[PDB]
Structure formats: structure tokens, C-alpha cells
Design a protein around this ligand. Structure first.
Ligand code: 7MD
Ligand code: 7MD
Lengths: 335, 335
């Protein structure tokens, strides 16, 4: 695979808004995120659509593609980071400068709607991109949870590329829709004990592929959707969905023969899942959809819309040990 | 193509609930629909999940598939009609009896989420199915709008298969979210003049394919998504979506090279479209996504979630005359 240069303290991070104009609509949280990374020693370059609104988006399709491309053209930038997701990153894909991405590999990081770009860029270039922090939701998060997010971010991207990396398990997590865009918290978020579950036995090692499942529907079937192959580990997460939507998305994967191919599934913790009173969790729905197909599942990986968030390279080998209840990166993912 | 026998007044219509359990949650409207069709002279067979609830759905995946299949097996039923949509019809697709459908073709009709079944059945069998009335939303509608819906339903399904059929244009329409499951009305729905627009010139003739666009994402990429071919007319409609979602769905089509294949696009009227304050309509968003591609568009066809609703066969040739502002079925669609 194509590998970007590793991150280092003091590096320059460029940020872009490929969908929702949250540098305006969540400006307080944006400013907190900016200050957080600056105090860590990072220099920041603001994408050209920062501070702009086109109602539901930051700008036209072409303007958003231009914003991203301009960061790729900047030789000082080591990391290109999403400000926030939304709905509309998939629009940009025909207009990204893939040749420039190949010529100037950088750490591309974000999540949620930005999946369209992360997966699309991988499909076109083979570049290992990252499911991880977006500036506003991730680094604008109030303490204590932001520190755990940052610890993973800095560890994954700066560590020496020798031997496997085994993920730490966040001690506590939350998904509460409070403390979004103000100077002070209303009150502390509920801190849940980590209820991540490993369904299965032994160890499964394979290339990880996926991201935000709902977002994948926007690139599905196209040349920008990476081919899922036999032995892959499927990584999927969703946010604030009804159980109805979750069944729909799981069945989509089934119809596409994904469950005939994958060796394991990682479900990211689902932010504020709406069970419609059924008290069912996504894993139970997946089990029905699977129709007896035995696939080991890591249910509740902390790489999703919940806080804190871990950083995950996409398109490289992971090993999930279902007996020892851990997950590791086993393939080099930065130069 | 595989063709069902035409409907006749006095025939037996079977109904099924492949997703939302609206025979329970919208019981008043359900009874209105039942009574409406019975008064027309039709006999009705209730699917086995009528009156059942599994929270967000009518029953398990397998039970919903069985409900549908049992209607196919009933020799007295000439028309199989959806009660309502939802989210979860795509789950049924591995379990439908396609061979039984081929052996005894029937009129299969519905819309919205039921698109998964209409498209899936066509993909597997070549049966010409119908984008049209579902029992609860369509026939539980109060007069006068229900009468116009019925006129199209009965005209399309009973007419002699000789010569082209040219659609009537409903004089007035509504998408107002009132008089749903209430027993007695306070006022009729606000009525709007038909603002259907023909963007383009000349005549375009091609096989119509599509349905509810959001629903198509649940079957996309699979063997149940019918292949869109050079010359097809793409028919798409959506309901109650944000402009953000509409851009995402249009761009999905673009990424899939759909706009390189289609000879025309039919946009169904979008029920309660949320423009996010932009005052933009779906056609304007489509125009941006198309990036200069000169595809003629019929914007605002009355075959969608708005009232009244026309009945449209899927998988047969239509002719859109953009100069004379009309749309016709030009290929035999019933035996
Ligand atoms: N207009 C909203 C933009 C959504 O951007 P996104 O990156 N998500 C996506 O792209 C997928 N939904 C795409 C998909 O499902 O296909 O959200 C990131 C987090 O921000 C939080 N958040 C955003 N606004 C608020 C708010 N007003 N109050 C509290 N939390 C908020 C959310 O709770 C999320 O956890
Ligand atoms: N929970 C309701 C089930 C949705 O079933 P569906 O067949 N739609 C779909 O399958 C797509 N959304 C799938 C997709 O977009 O992917 O809706 C049909 C009409 O019923 C009306 N309706 C339903 N409930 C109400 C209500 N409480 N008040 C007023 N109108 C209502 C709606 O306004 C629609 O016009």
C-alpha cells in the first residue's frame, strides 16, 4: 500500500469542510478544538471554506473539492483533517486530484460522512487513510474524554513502525448529546463502563475495510467503493440511527455477499441507537440478518461517534484476539 | 418480459406488510383503505402479519417473507398490494419465492420502501411490477384525492393492451401532513396547482427503471438491483428528505455512471422536501450534480408520496414527449 509520512509534534495540520459548515454553525466548539491542537504544538492551516456557509454545506461541490485539493498541494502539510461530517463528501470524488495525492501522500483523517473520501481515496490510490478524529466533534470535546481521544491520535500517528500495535481500551465512554457548542459544560456526561464484547474464539487476522456504514451507501457500487475480499475484516459504525435503519444497512451488506467474504466484523459503538422500544442492540439485529452464518464479531470498538475515539488505519491488516479480548494493527501503515 | 394477467373489478387483492406494522399503528386509515376497495367490488385477503407488531416492523425477516410468499401461492389472488412501506423490505429478498412468482405471475404493487421488492423481483424474474398505491397511505386517503389515485390504478391495470397509454395530469395535488390516522376531518388538505415541468426537447423513449431512490441504496450493488442500461429512463422519487440527503443520493447515481446511461430522468414530486432555507428544489441540485450533462428531465411526475398518485409499470418502455409535455406507456405491460 501507499504510505504517508508519520506525524510528529510541531507538524502542520490542514483542515477542510467537505460537508456541514460547522466552523460557522459550531464555532465555539471549533475554536476549542483549534486551541486544543495548538496547545499541543501543532500549526494549523485553515481550508479556504472555513467561515463560509452555503446553507446545509460549506460550498458548492467544486468549491469543496478545491478546498481539499489545495491542502494536498501544500508541501508544509503533514496531516489533512476533516472539521466535521454531514452528508455530502461523496459529491467531491470525481473532482479530487488523485495524481497529486499519490505524488504527495499525507495523513488523511476523519470519520462519519468523511468515509466517502477515506474509502474513495483508498480505492483510487491505495493510500492508507485513517478513521479517526475530526477537528470539531473530536477535539472540541470537553475534558476528560478529549484527552483519551488525543492519546490514541498521537500514539497511532507518531509511534515507531516496528512490531504490532495493540489498542488500549478506554476505561469509560459516553454518547450523550450535551455539551456541544458552549464555553462551559451544562453538566458532566454520563460515563459508562466499557461494555465492548468479543463474540467468538481464537484469532482472526485480515485487512480492515469500511467506515461509516450509512455513508458507504453513497459510494456503493462505484469505482470509489473499495472491493471487499475474502478474509477481510469489516469495520462498520453508525450514529443516531433507528433499529429500522440498522436492519436495512445490515441487510444491504448481506445482499451484497459481504458476509460470505469477511472473516470478522468490528461494530463501532453506536451513538444514541434508537431501539424503538425493542431493547435490542445492533448485534442482535446483525445475528438475525446473518441467518446462521458464523462470523466472529467485536461488538463495541471505540472508533465511532462515541467519546473517546481511537484512531484506526483503514486498508491494513488487523488481528483480533477473541480469546484474549484485544485488537492489534499488524501491518505497517505509515512510512 | 414476464407479464401478469390484467386486473378486473371483483378480483381478489391480497395485502402484505413487508416493513412498518401500519395495520396496527394506522388502524383507522387501514380500515378506510379496506372499505374503499371493498366498495369498488374487490375481495380482500389479509396477509398473515395483519394486526401484528414487532415494534418497528410487522415481524421477523423470515415471517415477512413467508407472508408475501403465501399470497403468491394463493390461486385466487390476482393482485398483491403493499399495506405501507417503512425501511425493511430489502431484508426479505433472499427468502422470496422467485420461482413461484415466475410460475404464476401476479400484479405486484406498492411504493416507497417496497421498491426493494419491486426492483428485486424484476431483477430475479423479469416480471413487470408496479410503482403505485399501497393500501394504507394511498387508499386510506380521504376524498377527493383518493378518487384520482383510484382512477389511475383502475385505468392502468384494467385497460386493453392496444396502442400507447398517455397519462392524465392531476389538476391539483397535496403533500400536507394532515388527516393521516384521525377518524374525522376538520378541513380538507391544501391543494396546489400542478407544477410539473418538462425540461428538454423532442421525444425520448426507453425502458423505465427505478423507484424510491433512498430505498434503492438498500439493494444497490447486489444481484437484486436491476442493471441500468444504455437508453433507460430513470424514474426516482423520495419523501420528506433534506436537501443534504438529496445531494448525497444524486451524487451516488453520478459516481455509479448512471447519468452516462440514461436517456431521461423522471423526478416524482418530493413530499415535504426540506430545502434547509436555500429555497432550492431537487432539480437544481440534480443540475449541479450533472455537471453540464444534457439529460432531459420530467420534474414533478405524480407517482410518489404526494396525493394523488398515478400507477406506473416498471421495466417497460415509456415515451416522454418534452415538446408536447406528455408521458406515455408504449410497451405491453400486462398479458
Ligand atoms: N449537521 C450535523 C453534522 C453531522 O456530522 P457528523 O460527522 N455525522 C455524520 O456525518 C453522519 N451522521 C453521516 C451519516 O450517518 O451518514 O457528526 C459528528 C458528531 O457531531 C455531533 N453533533 C453535531 N451537531 C450536534 C449538536 N447540535 N448537538 C450535539 N451533537 C452534535 C453528532 O452527535 C456526531 O456525534
Ligand atoms: N413510519 C411510517 C412508515 C413510512 O412508510 P412510507 O411508505 N415511506 C417509506 O417507506 C420511505 N420513507 C422509505 C425511504 O425513504 O427510504 O410512507 C408512506 C406515506 O405515509 C405517510 N405517513 C406515515 N405516517 C404518517 C403520520 N404519522 N402522519 C402523516 N403522514 C404519515 C408519509 O407521509 C408517507 O407519505
Amino acid at each position: 500500500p501507499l504510505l504517508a509520512a508519520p506525524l510528529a509534534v510541531g507538524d502542520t495540520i490542514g483542515f477542510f469542510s467537505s460537508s456541514a459548515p460547522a466552523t460557522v454553525t459550531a464555532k465555539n466548539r471549533f475554536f476549542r478544538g483549534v486551541e486544543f491542537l495548538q496547545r499541543k504544538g501543532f500549526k494549523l492551516v485553515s481550508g479556504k471554506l472555513t467561515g463560509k456557509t452555503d446553507f446545509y454545506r460549506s460550498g458548492t461541490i467544486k468549491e469543496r473539492a478545491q478546498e481539499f485539493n489545495e491542502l494536498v498541494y501544500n508541501p508544509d502539510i503533514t496531516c489533512i483533517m476533516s472539521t466535521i461530517g454531514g452528508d455530502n463528501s461523496n459529491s467531491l470524488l470525481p473532482f479530487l486530484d488523485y495524481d497529486a495525492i499519490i505524488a504527495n501522500p499525507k495523513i488523511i483523517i476523519g470519520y462519519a460522512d468523511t468515509t466517502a473520501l477515506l474509502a474513495g481515496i483508498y480505492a483510487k490510490t491505495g493510500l492508507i487513510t485513517f478513521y479517526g478524529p475530526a477537528l470539531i466533534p473530536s477535539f472540541g470535546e470537553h475534558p476528560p474524554l478529549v484527552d483519551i481521544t488525543y492519546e490514541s491520535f498521537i500514539k497511532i500517528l507518531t509511534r515507531k513502525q516496528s512490531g504490532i500495535y495493540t489498542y488500549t481500551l478506554p476505561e469509560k465512554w459516553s454518547d450523550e448529546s450535551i455539551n456541544w457548542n458552549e464555553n462551559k459544560i451544562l453538566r458532566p456526561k454520563k460515563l459508562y463502563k466499557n461494555n465492548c464484547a468479543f463474540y467468538g474464539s481464537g484469532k482472526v487476522e485480515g485487512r480492515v475495510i469500511g467506515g461509516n456504514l450509512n455513508t458507504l451507501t453513497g459510494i456503493w457500487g462505484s469505482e470509489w467503493m473499495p472491493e471487499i475480499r475474502n478474509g477481510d475484516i469489516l469495520f462498520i459504525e453508525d450514529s443516531r440511527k433507528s433499529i429500522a435503519t440498522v436492519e436495512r444497512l445490515f441487510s444491504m451488506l448481506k445482499l451484497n455477499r459481504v458476509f460470505d467474504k469477511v472473516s470478522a466484523i468490528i461494530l463501532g459503538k453506536h451513538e444514541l441507537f434508537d431501539c424503538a422500544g425493542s431493547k435490542r442492540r445492533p448485534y442482535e439485529v446483525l445475528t438475525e440478518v446473518l441467518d446462521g452464518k458464523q462470523i466472529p464479531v467485536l461488538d463495541g470498538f471505540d472508533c465511532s461517534h462515541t467519546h473517546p475515539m481511537l484512531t484506526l488505519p483503514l486498508g491494513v491488516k488487523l488481528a483480533i484476539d477473541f480469546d484474549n479480548k484485544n485488537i492489534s494493527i499488524t501491518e505497517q501503515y505509515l512510512s
